[PDB]
Motif scaffolding. Structure first.
Motif, mmCIF file in Angstrom:
data_model
loop_
_atom_site.group_PDB
_atom_site.id
_atom_site.type_symbol
_atom_site.label_atom_id
_atom_site.label_comp_id
_atom_site.label_asym_id
_atom_site.label_seq_id
_atom_site.Cartn_x
_atom_site.Cartn_y
_atom_site.Cartn_z
ATOM 1 N N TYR A 82 0.786 -1.232 0.000
ATOM 2 C CA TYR A 82 0.000 0.000 0.000
ATOM 3 C C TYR A 82 0.821 1.286 0.000
ATOM 4 C CZ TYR A 82 -3.620 -3.362 1.188
ATOM 5 O OH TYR A 82 -4.476 -4.443 1.187
ATOM 6 N N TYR A 83 2.151 1.214 -0.053
ATOM 7 C CA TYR A 83 2.963 2.417 0.071
ATOM 8 C C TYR A 83 4.119 2.380 -0.914
ATOM 9 C CZ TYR A 83 0.173 2.859 4.228
ATOM 10 O OH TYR A 83 -0.884 2.938 5.104
ATOM 11 N N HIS A 158 1.577 5.651 -7.371
ATOM 12 C CA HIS A 158 0.867 6.813 -6.852
ATOM 13 C C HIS A 158 0.252 6.419 -5.508
ATOM 14 C CE1 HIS A 158 -1.358 10.464 -6.524
ATOM 15 N NE2 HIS A 158 -2.523 9.855 -6.657
ATOM 16 N N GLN A 159 1.085 6.477 -4.464
ATOM 17 C CA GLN A 159 0.677 6.152 -3.095
ATOM 18 C C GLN A 159 1.439 7.054 -2.130
ATOM 19 O OE1 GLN A 159 2.286 2.227 -3.309
ATOM 20 N NE2 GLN A 159 0.289 1.194 -3.420
ATOM 21 N N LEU A 160 0.979 7.105 -0.878
ATOM 22 C CA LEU A 160 1.779 7.686 0.199
ATOM 23 C C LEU A 160 3.151 7.034 0.253
ATOM 24 C CD1 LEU A 160 -0.123 8.251 3.578
ATOM 25 C CD2 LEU A 160 0.786 9.965 2.027
ATOM 26 N N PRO A 164 1.744 6.364 8.020
ATOM 27 C CA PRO A 164 1.888 7.117 9.271
ATOM 28 C C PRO A 164 2.087 6.148 10.428
ATOM 29 C CG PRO A 164 -0.359 7.256 8.406
ATOM 30 C CD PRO A 164 0.466 6.617 7.335
ATOM 31 N N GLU A 277 -2.393 -2.104 12.487
ATOM 32 C CA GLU A 277 -2.958 -0.787 12.225
ATOM 33 C C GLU A 277 -2.099 0.068 11.299
ATOM 34 O OE1 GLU A 277 -1.439 1.012 16.527
ATOM 35 O OE2 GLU A 277 -3.460 1.484 15.785
ATOM 36 N N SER A 280 -0.892 -3.358 7.750
ATOM 37 C CA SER A 280 -2.103 -4.117 7.422
ATOM 38 C C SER A 280 -1.914 -4.979 6.178
ATOM 39 C CB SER A 280 -3.312 -3.191 7.249
ATOM 40 O OG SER A 280 -4.416 -3.667 8.007
ATOM 41 N N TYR B 80 -7.178 6.608 -0.431
ATOM 42 C CA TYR B 80 -6.359 5.408 -0.287
ATOM 43 C C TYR B 80 -7.157 4.133 -0.002
ATOM 44 C CZ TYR B 80 -2.729 9.006 0.168
ATOM 45 O OH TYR B 80 -1.904 10.091 -0.042
ATOM 46 N N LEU B 158 -7.367 -1.549 0.257
ATOM 47 C CA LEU B 158 -8.102 -1.996 1.432
ATOM 48 C C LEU B 158 -9.513 -1.423 1.412
ATOM 49 C CD1 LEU B 158 -6.213 -1.874 4.823
ATOM 50 C CD2 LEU B 158 -7.094 -3.882 3.604
ATOM 51 N N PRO B 162 -7.694 0.497 8.867
ATOM 52 C CA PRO B 162 -7.755 -0.013 10.238
ATOM 53 C C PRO B 162 -7.857 1.148 11.213
ATOM 54 C CG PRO B 162 -5.600 -0.476 9.209
ATOM 55 C CD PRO B 162 -6.462 0.135 8.150
ATOM 56 N N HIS B 163 -8.783 1.030 12.162
ATOM 57 C CA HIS B 163 -8.983 2.112 13.116
ATOM 58 C C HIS B 163 -9.714 1.600 14.345
ATOM 59 C CE1 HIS B 163 -12.811 1.935 10.959
ATOM 60 N NE2 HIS B 163 -13.357 2.498 12.020
ATOM 61 N N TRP B 187 -5.858 -10.719 13.020
ATOM 62 C CA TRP B 187 -7.100 -10.272 12.390
ATOM 63 C C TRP B 187 -8.126 -11.403 12.388
ATOM 64 C CZ3 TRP B 187 -8.136 -5.493 12.195
ATOM 65 C CH2 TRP B 187 -7.185 -4.516 11.831
ATOM 66 N N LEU B 220 -9.682 -2.576 17.582
ATOM 67 C CA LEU B 220 -9.083 -2.196 16.310
ATOM 68 C C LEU B 220 -9.718 -3.026 15.200
ATOM 69 C CD1 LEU B 220 -6.789 -0.775 14.677
ATOM 70 C CD2 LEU B 220 -5.341 -2.772 15.221
ATOM 71 N N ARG B 222 -10.908 -3.323 10.721
ATOM 72 C CA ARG B 222 -10.742 -2.886 9.344
ATOM 73 C C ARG B 222 -11.732 -3.651 8.473
ATOM 74 N NH1 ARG B 222 -5.445 -6.000 6.602
ATOM 75 N NH2 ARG B 222 -6.374 -8.095 6.859
ATOM 76 N N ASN B 274 -5.045 12.009 10.963
ATOM 77 C CA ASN B 274 -3.716 11.981 10.374
ATOM 78 C C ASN B 274 -3.170 10.562 10.276
ATOM 79 O OD1 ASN B 274 -3.791 14.710 10.047
ATOM 80 N ND2 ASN B 274 -2.395 15.184 11.740
ATOM 81 N N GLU B 275 -3.354 9.747 11.322
ATOM 82 C CA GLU B 275 -2.814 8.394 11.265
ATOM 83 C C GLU B 275 -3.745 7.383 10.607
ATOM 84 O OE1 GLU B 275 -3.819 7.528 15.963
ATOM 85 O OE2 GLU B 275 -1.864 6.975 15.114
ATOM 86 N N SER B 278 -5.184 10.117 6.679
ATOM 87 C CA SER B 278 -3.993 10.768 6.137
ATOM 88 C C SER B 278 -4.252 11.375 4.762
ATOM 89 C CB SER B 278 -2.816 9.785 6.074
ATOM 90 O OG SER B 278 -1.612 10.419 6.439
#
Ligand SMILES: CC(C)C[C@@H]1NC(=O)[C@H]([C@@H](C)CCO)NC1=O
Ligand SMILES: CC(C)C[C@@H]1NC(=O)[C@H]([C@@H](C)CCO)NC1=O
Ligand SMILES: O=C(O)CCC(=O)C(=O)O
Ligand SMILES: O=C(O)CCC(=O)C(=O)O
Ligand SMILES: [Cl-]
Ligand SMILES: [Fe+2]
Ligand SMILES: [Fe+2]
Lengths: 289, 287
Positions: A82-83, A158-160, A164, A277, A280, B80, B158, B162-163, B187, B220, B222, B274-275, B278
């Motif tokens: 994903y990155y 095209h990803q972050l 974070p 988190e 993933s 994303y 995804l 995830p949160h 998971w 947590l 997703r 932000n986390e 983002s």
């Protein structure tokens, strides 16, 4: 947005000396600061690995061969779904088994700086030396797990750049040369600029948890790398870093307000929640085993 | 899949069908709650099948269920992630959603408050401090959020970031697989149970109870990447959340049982965004 204004330190006879007026107090409140790179260190083996590890072993000179071909090493190479980042992550034994000895030498120097920051911080927080080995799972004296990461930011995706995250260990010593790193300060992403001749130092989740009940807790900064875009004739972004972590088989500690160390949770389950988190993806043992 | 507790409604009391009861559900951080038999779920399922569609073409009856991609206040297209979703507080629901949906949200919100009061009672927290530590959410104040989520299968990402939910209590409707929870570091799928909502707790409940004898965790979770089409429709979900208002403070019960404000809600939410996401929607769930 303007970049963070951080403290700057240098090492002088194995002690941390701060060039800016805020000193260690302000740096711990910020959760990050710049540390001058000892003048005798050769950084080029690390930069060389960051420029080469994702390239095929062939074709190319036999000299660059030990710096290439790492996309084949399932134990230490991690292609992130994903990155933009792909990265080596290798502990002490893995570095000695798989990385060139000049890279291993560079990591050992960076690790000593991370341990110097760790002992300086524990002393600055008034934590009794008698409990240092226990609350760091041995990391304070060069044991525990001493991680190394080498990151290449793939611009064709095209990803972050980087998920974070908060680093998971006690202290991080990071080498960067390009813009792209950002930190969450008061809820806003603030760039952290590369400072030539300096490492960036920050703390991880183990330091955050250890100090969360003290008078001046130390935070693990939340940071990411934004999506990297190629600028013509500028190389792809890379970074490399060492991290002083508690071992995944042990426990994380927290100082009670009465000054006593308490084992509060297992490291491995903490890392698994972190991987779930943050990344993933399929690399569910990343940084554990 | 998890083996969760099941509860059902009975005169404004939470009654558990399974033996672990509220104690076990608070330990798991989630449980199934029977959907009251008179509730019509179709307005919510309809909105979840229509909100991301253009205003036209289509019937005049479905028009108020469509065209929400142009509402900058409540619609959030995620860069994303497969999910695109409506997020609307009380006033926004009043102002932008069909009354049939607003009525279903009110019924779900009442269940969320029933859960919240049952949980505060079960933890021995003094009723005199409920309005302070929940920022008014316990009695229907604070911020009562609604989300309608559509998982776009043409996006190879995804499903949902995830949160941990951010508030006190969540009441979630799901019909399809995809939802997963992090249990013991692994998971674990949470399966849809016909006739039941999924209930879980958020960051605010976790922080409030972290130093009590029986802390309640915010699970947590997703949504996996949703495989494209074949026969079944796209995945959707909708849910309500009882949250503290962004302008207030988050509280935590001390070692002696007295509430202490530990941090501001807005800065908590900005860090969360932000986390978790983002992306450019930096005022999501705040403004
Ligand atoms: C960006 C990535 C290469 C490093 C990043 N930072 C950390 O501190 C940990 C490492 C030490 C692994 C142990 O958890 N995890 C991460 O994901
Ligand atoms: C997936 C998304 C639709 C909802 C998800 N869950 C939450 O609890 C919050 C909501 C209530 C907004 C306030 O923070 N944030 C989230 O991201
Ligand atoms: O590449 C960067 O600047 C960040 C690297 C990082 O955060 C890490 O290795 O943990
Ligand atoms: O779609 C799902 O199953 C979960 C949605 C969710 O987690 C949320 O709305 O907060
Ligand atoms: Cl929960
Ligand atoms: Fe990092
Ligand atoms: Fe959620």
């Amino acid at each position: 947005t303007k970049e963070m204004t951080l403290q700057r330190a240098r090492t002088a006879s194995g002690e941390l000396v701060f060039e800016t007026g805020g000193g260690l107090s302000q740096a711990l409140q910020d959760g990050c600061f710049y540390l001058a790179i000892p003048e005798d260190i050769d950084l080029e083996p690390g930069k060389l690995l960051c420029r080469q590890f994702y390239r095929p072993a062939h074709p190319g000179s036999p000299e660059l061969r030990p710096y290439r071909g790492f996309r084949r090493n399932d134990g230490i190479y991690f292609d992130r779904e994903y990155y933009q980042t792909e990265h080596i992550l290798a502990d002490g034994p893995a570095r000695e088994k798989y990385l060139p000895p000049d890279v291993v030498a560079l990591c050992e120097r960076m690790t000593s700086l991370a341990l110097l920051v760790l002992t300086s911080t524990l002393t600055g927080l008034g934590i009794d030396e008698a409990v240092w080995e226990k609350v760091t799972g041995g990391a304070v004296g060069g044991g525990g797990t001493q991680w190394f990461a080498a990151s290449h930011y793939r611009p064709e995706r095209h990803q972050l750049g980087c998920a974070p995250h908060k680093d998971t260990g006690f202290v991080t010593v990071l080498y960067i040369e390009q813009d792209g790193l950002e930190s969450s300060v008061g809820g806003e992403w603030i760039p952290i600029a590369p400072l030539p001749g300096y490492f960036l130092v920050n703390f991880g989740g183990a330091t955050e948890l250890l100090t969360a009940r003290m008078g001046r807790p130390v935070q693990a900064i939340l940071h990411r790398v934004r999506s990297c875009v190629t600028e013509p004739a500028r190389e792809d972004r890379f970074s490399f870093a060492v991290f002083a972590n508690p071992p995944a088989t042990g426990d994380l500690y927290q100082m009670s307000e009465s000054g006593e160390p308490v084992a509060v949770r297992g490291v491995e389950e903490f890392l698994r929640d972190f991987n779930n988190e943050t990344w993933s993806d399929r690399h569910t043992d990343f940084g554990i085993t």
